[PDB]
Design an enzyme around this catalytic site. Structure first.
Site, short mmCIF file in Angstrom:
data_model
loop_
_atom_site.label_atom_id
_atom_site.label_comp_id
_atom_site.label_asym_id
_atom_site.label_seq_id
_atom_site.Cartn_x
_atom_site.Cartn_y
_atom_site.Cartn_z
N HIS A 197 -4.53 1.38 8.28
CA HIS A 197 -5.27 0.19 8.49
C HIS A 197 -5.10 -0.42 9.93
O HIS A 197 -5.35 -1.50 10.25
CB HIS A 197 -5.31 -0.92 7.48
CG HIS A 197 -3.73 -1.07 7.24
ND1 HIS A 197 -2.87 -0.32 6.29
CD2 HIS A 197 -2.70 -1.81 7.54
CE1 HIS A 197 -1.62 -0.76 6.10
NE2 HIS A 197 -1.64 -1.93 7.04
N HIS A 254 6.26 -3.11 2.75
CA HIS A 254 5.13 -2.57 3.41
C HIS A 254 5.59 -1.84 4.85
O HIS A 254 6.42 -2.65 5.59
CB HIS A 254 4.22 -3.99 3.42
CG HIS A 254 2.80 -3.27 4.37
ND1 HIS A 254 2.04 -2.36 3.57
CD2 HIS A 254 2.44 -3.59 5.34
CE1 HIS A 254 0.94 -2.14 4.25
NE2 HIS A 254 1.21 -2.96 5.68
N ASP A 300 6.85 -6.95 4.92
CA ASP A 300 6.89 -5.91 6.20
C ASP A 300 8.32 -5.50 6.54
O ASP A 300 9.08 -6.25 6.96
CB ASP A 300 6.27 -6.65 7.22
CG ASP A 300 4.99 -7.35 7.06
OD1 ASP A 300 4.36 -7.15 6.32
OD2 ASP A 300 4.69 -8.16 8.07
N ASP A 335 -2.45 -4.38 2.22
CA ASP A 335 -2.92 -4.81 3.70
C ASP A 335 -4.19 -4.53 4.12
O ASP A 335 -4.74 -5.10 5.42
CB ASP A 335 -1.92 -4.45 4.69
CG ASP A 335 -1.57 -5.12 6.08
OD1 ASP A 335 -1.52 -6.47 5.99
OD2 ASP A 335 -1.66 -4.58 7.07
N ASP A 344 3.91 0.08 8.04
CA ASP A 344 2.80 0.64 9.12
C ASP A 344 3.22 1.80 9.63
O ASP A 344 4.14 2.04 10.32
CB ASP A 344 2.45 -0.56 9.86
CG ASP A 344 2.14 -2.00 9.13
OD1 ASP A 344 1.24 -1.96 8.16
OD2 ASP A 344 3.14 -2.85 9.51
#
Ligand SMILES: CCCCCCC[C@H]1[C@@H](O)[C@@H](O)[C@H]2[C@H](O)CCCN21
Ligand SMILES: [Zn+2]
Length: 1006
Positions: A439, A60, A309, A174, A62
């Site tokens: 997000h 994951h 993450d 997420d 970001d």
């Protein structure tokens, strides 16, 4: 076609229904904290009914959070994909799924040909697999459906071009709550399956009990059943390895082989290398988890995510996970007693296997409609603060959303020489916008320096949209014989009265007119909607004595108002307005063609024109300073604070209380003064709340209190009060009023500023909010659930109604809101918070800036409206409410001519354009081809809303988007990403889109 008002859809799981029936009791359920001790019969599994296990590795990523996109790229993600490339190449059976194309593209353009071909190999053979394939993994609460499509198309197109791949499985681990707008879009984009994670733990509980975590997810109106997308809800608290292997985190944690000593298991129990010594026992431990998890699913197929993450960063993380897992598999699969086939798999592999198991009669799957708001991860931790967090950037989203559509449309009409750099600028405009769909972007949930980065990106995107727009208008409105362009030159600059907004920044140009110096000025309006629109527009002018004509030199009714600018004397702690003596607002109604341009001329004289009216200005205060307006005709009238009652046109008569807050609405000249009380209230933080969590200390209490400015004109009247924090304004243009607030929370700490509407409407427990500006969903306020649980996203609109009345509030920016009482609407403005949520940020919200929020307010009589059943989970706007929204989100674009003379100026563009039924919208127009291409292609996305029939109907031209450009030679109907032809249209005519449907067509030209 199909009816969406009479015929209530028959679903297994209607989410509003379920919400009424659930206990929502926070029961300690064991090692699975928010469930129970799962029991399975081991004699379920034999040789004829083996357990099929897909272990699915992921990281994951970001695109910005604690660190900026480019920071995360250098520190983390480049390594991740550099290893994925090396490892999947080296290890034929090793698998990995990827979601974020933003990073993927960032990486791939750095690659070294050889590397690109190898990357292609491991995609081709199915080892690396793109899931969703969005530019980002979008927020589902605050994001507009158009931008959801935008981000999707950015990524999926990139994938089509560079990878030759189009994902048909989605991955949303997420997002903080899930929206049905996702399956809506994904199913219309040729997707087969989707996966969600963050739903309410009690819903995870209720559904798991019933084997309902896999479901055909359909839209709340969809009777026929065609919107239905297959959904896998994952059952546990997290997507981490702890919460993915099965119900016991203490166990699950020991199979996260990265944890052996920077990282460690917070259940005190370390992982251990797998060997011939321990294999059989560890294998038993694990298979017991799998089998437990598998009990929650209707098939003997099971999905085991493996990651976290920014995982798979280290080279050695790839060995430790892979080798150990290989050992377990190799054992388990040779140990017939287990009855398990286990392997590294992708999300498609999992999905295909589920369906193949359904082919073989194992399961029949349930239907579900509804949404997954408002998410709570634990106890009374509802994530309804993020509906509101960093509201500036929430506004900015909408502004840029509009600027993207308009720039694409305006430049769509012509093919452009490569030297113009139109492609390059549109590409960037979309990317920056697409990035903010993440997000941690639009949610307002990132660190200060990252929010700053997003702003800069969005600012550049806007700068890019302006350039494309002006160059285009110049081409559309200049005689071909004159058109001789410098691509780098400014023909026009935009004027935006709404962004940033006049309190926020002094950003609007003054048009400087004068008998000697510059006598007249060409202005151009753009109408992005495919109908005839009339709308009031304003410009800043250097004189009050200005008259408006069209290019046909026919006079146009104008109003001049002064330029007001609210000051705060720290001297007094007073919110005083100030007039400008040097600049003025000219206001006139512009008539603009469907998807067209209309030019206008502002000319000065030495005195008052025939057709230019002046507005009077009443400044209600106890103890005034007399106030100069220079050359402005009417002097400021003063008075003691009074109750007010203004009208404009025939459109409603609004009564205001004595401190300038709307107190009632009278519709007709027969109808009652129907009461509507605007109030401002403050919330606080518990001592017993941050960027994500809304944690109130009790009900909201009112703001203690006060200068009132009334402007009264033939075209436009306003009522403007300066309270502490908020400059509240009510503007009237002969329809539903406009509410503008300049919110500055600023100093006020641990505070949340809301806007309540107390009406005497008999709504009761019912209200309706929207989802992604696509659909209105029914909300029942629930006495059981706490306050913050009743807060929903308001991305575009909300409404309460009784049997006779409705009151709709449209927004221009996504915020949080609820109907906390019978006849209430409320909506959060800003929030300043010192305490962190402890969701991983480290900060609260201490970075607030002034924001101009915009609204519309539609009171209506609904008794003779064709209304949906009490049972129906949806709402639908009226004409009035719908147009009010369009008016907020897609206003008229205003362009001022930059130079002194416009040789070749034409009056109008697109008077020949069909004016489509008001419920239809061309959501996207985009040229898909560069100039140096044989056949020109132009994609259109058409969305048809559904509105209440109310008697309300004047004839309008059918629009066939295939024939909007000449020389049509092919019109295929496509996926919403434009990446797959669904239909050959014979005669190259695009059929009518059904209400609530969204089609996309691509027309080819010669
Ligand atoms: C983790 C990171 O991916 C970041 O996206 C963060 C969210 O903001 C809140 C839930 C936990 N998430
Ligand atoms: Zn995240």
């Amino acid at each position: 076609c199909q009816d969406v008002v009479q015929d209530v859809p028959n679903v297994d799981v209607q989410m509003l229904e379920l919400y009424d029936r659930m206990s929502f009791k926070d029961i300690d359920g064991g090692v699975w904290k928010q469930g129970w001790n799962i029991k399975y019969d081991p004699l379920k599994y034999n040789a004829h009914h083996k357990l099929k296990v897909f272990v699915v590795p992921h990281s994951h990523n970001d695109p910005g959070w604690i660190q900026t996109f480019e920071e995360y790229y250098q520190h983390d993600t480049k390594h991740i994909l550099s290893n994925a490339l090396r490892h999947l190449h080296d290890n034929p059976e090793m698998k990995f799924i990827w979601a974020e194309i933003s990073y993927f593209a960032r990486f791939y353009h750095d690659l070294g040909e050889n590397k690109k071909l190898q990357m292609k190999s491991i995609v081709k053979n199915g080892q690396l697999e793109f899931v969703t394939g969005g530019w980002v993994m979008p927020d589902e609460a605050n994001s507009h459906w158009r931008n959801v499509l935008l981000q999707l198309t950015e990524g999926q197109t990139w994938l089509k071009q560079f990878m030759n791949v189009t994902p048909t499985a989605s991955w949303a681990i997420d997002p903080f709550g899930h929206s049905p707008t996702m399956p809506y879009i994904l199913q219309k984009s040729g997707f087969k399956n989707m996966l969600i994670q963050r739903t309410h733990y009690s819903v995870k509980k209720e559904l798991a009990q019933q084997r309902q975590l896999e479901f055909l997810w359909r839209q709340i109106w969809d009777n026929k059943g065609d919107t239905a997308l297959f959904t896998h809800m994952m059952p546990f608290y997290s997507y981490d390895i702890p919460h993915t292997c099965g119900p016991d985190p203490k166990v699950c944690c020991q199979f996260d082989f990265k944890r052996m000593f920077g990282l460690s298991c917070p259940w005190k129990v370390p992982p251990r290398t797998i060997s011939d010594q321990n294999v059989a026992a560890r294998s038993d431990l694990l298979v017991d988890q799998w089998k437990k998890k598998a009990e929650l699913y209707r098939t003997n197929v099971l999905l085991i995510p493996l990651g976290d993450d920014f995982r798979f960063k280290q080279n050695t993380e790839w060995d430790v996970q892979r080798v150990n897992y290989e050992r377990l598999f190799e054992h388990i699969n040779s140990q017939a007693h287990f009855n398990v086939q286990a392997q590294f798999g992708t999300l498609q592999e999992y999905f295909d296997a589920v369906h193949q198991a359904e082919r073989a009669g194992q399961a029949e799957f349930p239907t579900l409609s509804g949404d997954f708001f408002t998410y709570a991860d634990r106890s009374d931790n509802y994530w309804s603060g993020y509906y509101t967090s960093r509201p500036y950037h929430k506004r900015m989203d909408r502004v840029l959303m509009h600027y993207v559509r308009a720039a694409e449309m305006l430049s769509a009409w012509h093919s452009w020489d490569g030297m113009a750099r139109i492609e390059e600028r549109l590409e960037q405009a979309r990317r920056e916008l697409s990035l903010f769909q993440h997000h941690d972007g639009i949610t307002g949930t990132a660190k200060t320096h990252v929010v700053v980065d997003y702003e800069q990106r969005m600012q550049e995107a806007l700068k890019a949209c302006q350039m494309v727009m002006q160059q285009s208008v110049y081409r559309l409105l200049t005689k071909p014989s004159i058109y001789s362009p410098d691509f780098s030159f400014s023909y026009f600059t935009l004027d935006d009265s709404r962004w940033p907004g006049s309190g926020v920044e002094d950003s609007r140009t003054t048009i400087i007119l004068g008998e000697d110096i510059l006598p007249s000025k060409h202005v151009v309006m753009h109408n992005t909607l495919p109908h005839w629109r009339e709308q009031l527009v304003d410009f800043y002018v250097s004189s009050p004595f200005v008259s408006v004509t069209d290019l046909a030199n026919n006079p146009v009714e104008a109003q001049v108002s002064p330029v007001w600018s609210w000051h705060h004397d720290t001297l007094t702690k007073t919110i005083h307005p100030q007039g400008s003596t040097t600049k003025y607002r000219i206001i006139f109604k512009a008539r603009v063609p469907p998807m067209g341009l209309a030019t206008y001329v502002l000319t000065i004289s030495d005195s008052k024109p025939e057709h230019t009216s002046y507005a009077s200005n009443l400044l209600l205060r106890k103890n005034p300073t007399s106030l100069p307006l220079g050359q402005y005709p009417e002097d400021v009238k003063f008075g003691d604070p009074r109750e007010i009652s203004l009208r404009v046109g025939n459109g409603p008569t609004l009564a205001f209380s004595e401190q300038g807050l709307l107190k009632s609405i009278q519709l007709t000249q027969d109808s009652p003064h129907v009461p509507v009380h605007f109030k401002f209230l403050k919330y606080g933080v518990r001592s017993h709340s941050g960027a994500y969590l809304f944690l109130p200390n009790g009900p909201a209490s009112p703001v203690e209190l006060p200068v009132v400015l009334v402007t009264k004109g033939k075209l436009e009247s306003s009522v403007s009060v300066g309270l502490p924090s908020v400059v509240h304004q009510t503007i009237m243009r002969g329809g539903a009023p406009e509410i503008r607030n300049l919110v500055d929370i600023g100093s006020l700490d641990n505070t949340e500023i809301v806007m309540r509407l107390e009406t005497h409407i008999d709504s009761g427990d019912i209200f309706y909010t929207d989802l992604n500006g696509l659909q209105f969903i029914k909300r029942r306020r629930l006495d059981k659930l706490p306050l913050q649980a009743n807060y929903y996203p308001i991305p575009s609109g909300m409404f309460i109604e009784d049997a006779n009345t409705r009151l709709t509030l449209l927004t221009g920016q996504p915020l949080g809101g609820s109907s906390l009482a019978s006849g209430e609407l409320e909506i959060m403005q800003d929030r300043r918070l010192a305490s962190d949520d402890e969701r991983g940020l480290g900060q609260g919200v201490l970075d607030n800036k002034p924001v101009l929020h915009i609204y519309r307010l539609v009171l209506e009589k609904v008794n003779n409206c064709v209304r949906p059943s009490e049972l129906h989970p949806a709402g639908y706007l009226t004409s009035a409410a719908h147009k009010a929204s369009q008016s907020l989100l897609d206003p008229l674009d205003k362009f001022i001519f930059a130079e002194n003379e416009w040789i070749g100026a034409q009056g109008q563009f697109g008077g020949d354009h069909p004016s489509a039924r008001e419920d239809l919208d061309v959501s996207v127009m985009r040229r898909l081809t560069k100039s140096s291409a044989k056949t020109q292609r132009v994609g259109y996305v058409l969305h048809r809303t559904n509105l209440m029939q109310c008697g309300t109907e004047e004839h309008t031209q059918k629009l066939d988007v295939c024939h909007l450009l000449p020389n049509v030679a092919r019109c295929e109907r496509t996926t919403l990403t434009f990446l797959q032809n669904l239909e050959h249209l014979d005669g190259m005519v695009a059929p009518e889109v059904c209400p609530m449907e969204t089609a996309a067509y691509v027309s080819s030209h010669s």
